[PDB]
Design a protein around this ligand. Sequence first.
Ligand code: ELE
Ligand code: ELE
Lengths: 281, 281
Amino acid sequence: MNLLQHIAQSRQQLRKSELKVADHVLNDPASVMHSSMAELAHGVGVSEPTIVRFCRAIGCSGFQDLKLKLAQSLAAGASFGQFSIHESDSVADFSLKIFDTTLHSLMEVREHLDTHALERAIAAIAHAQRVEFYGFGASGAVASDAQHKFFRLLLSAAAYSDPHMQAMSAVTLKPSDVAICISQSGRSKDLLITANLVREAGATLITLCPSQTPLADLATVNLAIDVHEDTDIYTPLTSRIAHLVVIDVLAMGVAMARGPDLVNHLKSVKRSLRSLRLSPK
Amino acid sequence: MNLLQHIAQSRQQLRKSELKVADHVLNDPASVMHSSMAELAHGVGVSEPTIVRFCRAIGCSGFQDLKLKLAQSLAAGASFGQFSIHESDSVADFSLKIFDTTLHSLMEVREHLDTHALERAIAAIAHAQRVEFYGFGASGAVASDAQHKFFRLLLSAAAYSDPHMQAMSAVTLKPSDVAICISQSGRSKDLLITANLVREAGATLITLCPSQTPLADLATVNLAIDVHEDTDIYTPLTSRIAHLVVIDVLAMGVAMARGPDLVNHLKSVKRSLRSLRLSPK
Ligand SMILES: O=C(O)C(=O)C[C@H](O)[C@H](O)COP(=O)(O)O
Ligand SMILES: O=C(O)C(=O)C[C@H](O)[C@H](O)COP(=O)(O)O
């Protein structure tokens, strides 16, 4: 377990004095490592006992343990991704950690699914003429990925990561239609504007985001996907995998809702690639 | 196990007479289901014993078993995705099947990693000034997804799914630089053109695709990602998840190769979002 991630996760447990230590530590770990307890206490503006209580609340044995573990937690890639990367990891180590973390997160998401929320989303999309996917950064990529899966299911599918296009498109939706807003944070300002416009048009807003976020509150159907990845700190990685697997379940659901006609539709779609891909052998 | 998928998978095992049956069955399952053995034999242009041998080679007990199982394998969504969907599945059923299939595939990919191929790809990218991601359809979405992960790692990252842009961009690459071609099939014609241009420019071609494909043969570093998903038939789904997790391992590898400077780089990148996302609480 990477001590900096642990400290970041732990902040809502600390007392105010200890929190001040936590934030000083997160802001500059490498100074702390060459710091006496007195210097650090001076730095943060707290007593030496506060330092030690912080260390113990973090699960270290005391100040020397803090520094030791800090020294093991400063890999550059530990900041890149929420994986327990250690200063000296090899492809051997980080490859398996990344896959294992992904497996563990998807299992957790699978376990926590709101099956009913899924059923309502699938039935909304299945009755829609248009489905749109809205998001930014990582969630924009998910949006366009989802458009590529959904365009073949006998409706109009579109994805936008330009908020001006989202707004203008949204307000043209019939109440009969669906928009999915995708957000690991649930806190993207433009996306809440867009979500409000969807609502105002009377269309179904599906939120693919954690529960009890600003965006979740606006939703018609809150999918409640609670991957624990702190994207104020880490690159979004695990969160978008979970989002895409959820997208795939909605798509499957919509396919389910179509007739035996779909089979031949999908066969035409695949046939159209014949001249663009070499034959197998 | 969905009988139509099983039959499709099984084709390379059959004898020529049985194969003719397989393809007739795949092409129109619903006719077969209301067909006598004699009619089907007439249809395909084979003997009744051939029909029965086909059934047995497919692991059915005989012709009546074939029809029964066919009747259970005709869900519209069974054609949409390579998941063992049955005529009457509920979100309960297909949601868990989709997650389970994904977990099983990622475990298989994790087990089969070519760790050395990973190390060589990571070191190529880590010395490059430019990294480019090329693909189409699902693989285009992966390309743009990867660009969103990589732009923060102190190089120029670009993704193109327009083959004309790929060609023109490729030929401007220094031998020092990297292109990743992404393909579940390994058989996209434009992508082989692009891959050849990368080679011709002396730049490192990483192929994120199955081994022993046309594209794998062109590679400088073949990542050998052998997800078993037949995208001549099914929507690409599981394949692109595996691709993205592999992308994330390469990104982690590159982060690893940077100094402690990266920490503050990545912190600036995250700080720039402050005015665009509400604060937590
Ligand atoms: O690239 C990064 O480091 C990011 O964190 C950018 C985020 O993907 C976007 O700001 C979208 O944020 P969400 O609306 O919470 O999905
Ligand atoms: O949407 C579908 O049904 C497709 O199969 C389209 C494929 O994603 C592209 O043709 C790219 O193919 P690859 O180069 O093998 O990755």
